[PDB]
Amino acid sequence: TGNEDIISRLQEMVADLELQQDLSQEHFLFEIFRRRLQALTSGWSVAASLQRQRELLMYKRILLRLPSSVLCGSSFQAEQPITARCEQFFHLVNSEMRNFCSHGGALTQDITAHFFRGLLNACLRSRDPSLMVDFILAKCQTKCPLILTSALVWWPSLEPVLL
Amino acid sequence: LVFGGRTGNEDIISRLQEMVADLELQQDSQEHFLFEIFRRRLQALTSGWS
Amino acid sequence: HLPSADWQRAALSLWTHRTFREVLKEEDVHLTYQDWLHLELEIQPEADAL
Amino acid sequence: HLPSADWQRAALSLWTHRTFREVLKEEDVHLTYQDWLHLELEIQPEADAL
Amino acid sequence: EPHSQALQDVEKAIMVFEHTGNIPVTVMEASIFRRPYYVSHFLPALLTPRVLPKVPDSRVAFIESLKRADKIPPSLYSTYCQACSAEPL
């Protein structure tokens, strides 16, 4: 309620830079996220805890608007240059969003779908699609198991879209 | 008296913009559904000088 | 149940009701995607409950 | 187009005047991108002007 | 019926004119070459002998743009202005 042209201007520039980089490298967004979460008080104070939650739900919202390509990139080039920006995203899901943007030992229907949509986009755009999907979902047992445990809850949602 | 008209929803032109940018990458020769819908609606009008 | 009570309570007491659920199954009532759109398009950004 | 020609002309007369242009140069006053964003975020999609 | 049709016709004219500016051109043709229809349509372009709001708006600017177009013979605009002034129980 003020801004529903400015988030359109954001969509513009984010999809632009996706294509500019498709001419492996990591997104500037996650840097800004780390800066602001660090520059909040590391105090436990309920005021600060709630302020961190607020700033994170705004982050969750902003990625939902912007393409599913910022998470997984697009076109996983080879198996050697692999898991670049997904680790960026996983670190955020462990450090922050598992605290606030969660329920029941799991994530949100919304980001869960926003991820899996982006995942199948880059993977099917790449060769060895089934094999490389199986690669990143084996990695998730080690690095960000929240995604797998989210997709367990929000499966009856995703499976139709994925199929 | 009708006195111009209401805007209503610049939420839903953003919800479309989602799914469109999505199908854009999902495909990247074969043709879009959009111009199909446009042609159907302009055909379903009258052709008149009215 | 016909109270002049608070309306938040009223709405949800209605939701709970079995027979209201039994109704939504008979299904020019189950709210198509497009019926949804046509209400949601009416509303304005100007006033809003959300 | 828009409200009183007087108010419109007042704005244009001000904008044209030299000493306004000489003011805008030496400046914190020259409207940072971020300052501009703060005002454009302050406004709504409700009462437009445009 | 041309008293009701004219209304629905000018409705479309104004809500186009909103999304645009500068007078939907169907109507400005209808002006010079459907002159009796221009007058049967033109009725609802000033059938607002009604409270003029404080803020100028759709209907207002539509009529403004017409009188700038040198159309609206001033007789009917003067009409608009003046009418707008507005036991067993």
UniProtKB/Swiss-Prot annotation, chain A:
Superkingdom, taxonomy of origin: Eukaryota
Transmembrane regions: none
Post-translational modification (record): Phosphorylation is required for the formation of the nuclear complex. Not phosphorylated in cells derived from groups A, B, C, E, F, G, and H.
Resulting phenotype, S69F: In FANCA; benign
Location of this chain's protein in the cell: Nucleus; Cytoplasm
Function: DNA repair protein that may operate in a postreplication repair or a cell cycle checkpoint function. May be involved in interstrand DNA cross-link repair and in the maintenance of normal chromosome stability.
Disease: Fanconi anemia, complementation group A: A disorder affecting all bone marrow elements and resulting in anemia, leukopenia and thrombopenia. It is associated with cardiac, renal and limb malformations, dermal pigmentary changes, and a predisposition to the development of malignancies. At the cellular level it is associated with hypersensitivity to DNA-damaging agents, chromosomal instability (increased chromosome breakage) and defective DNA repair.
Quaternary structure and partners: Belongs to the multisubunit FA complex composed of FANCA, FANCB, FANCC, FANCE, FANCF, FANCG, FANCL/PHF9 and FANCM. The complex is not found in FA patients. In complex with FANCF, FANCG and FANCL, but not with FANCC, nor FANCE, interacts with HES1; this interaction may be essential for the stability and nuclear localization of FA core complex proteins. The complex with FANCC and FANCG may also include EIF2AK2 and HSP70. Interacts with FAAP20/C1orf86; interaction is direct.
Protein name: Fanconi anemia group A protein
Gene: FANCA
First-to-last residue of the parent protein present: 1012 to 1182 of 1455
Curated annotation (Swiss-Prot), chain E:
Compartment(s): Nucleus; Cytoplasm
The record's account of how the chain is modified after translation: Phosphorylation is required for the formation of the nuclear complex. Not phosphorylated in cells derived from groups A, B, C, E, F, G, and H.
Superkingdom, taxonomy of origin: Eukaryota
Clinical disorder: Fanconi anemia, complementation group A: A disorder affecting all bone marrow elements and resulting in anemia, leukopenia and thrombopenia. It is associated with cardiac, renal and limb malformations, dermal pigmentary changes, and a predisposition to the development of malignancies. At the cellular level it is associated with hypersensitivity to DNA-damaging agents, chromosomal instability (increased chromosome breakage) and defective DNA repair.
Function: DNA repair protein that may operate in a postreplication repair or a cell cycle checkpoint function. May be involved in interstrand DNA cross-link repair and in the maintenance of normal chromosome stability.
Quaternary structure, from the entry: Belongs to the multisubunit FA complex composed of FANCA, FANCB, FANCC, FANCE, FANCF, FANCG, FANCL/PHF9 and FANCM. The complex is not found in FA patients. In complex with FANCF, FANCG and FANCL, but not with FANCC, nor FANCE, interacts with HES1; this interaction may be essential for the stability and nuclear localization of FA core complex proteins. The complex with FANCC and FANCG may also include EIF2AK2 and HSP70. Interacts with FAAP20/C1orf86; interaction is direct.
Name of the protein in its database record: Fanconi anemia group A protein
Organism placement in taxonomy: Eukaryota, Metazoa, Chordata, Craniata, Vertebrata
Residues of the full protein shown: 542 to 650 of 1455
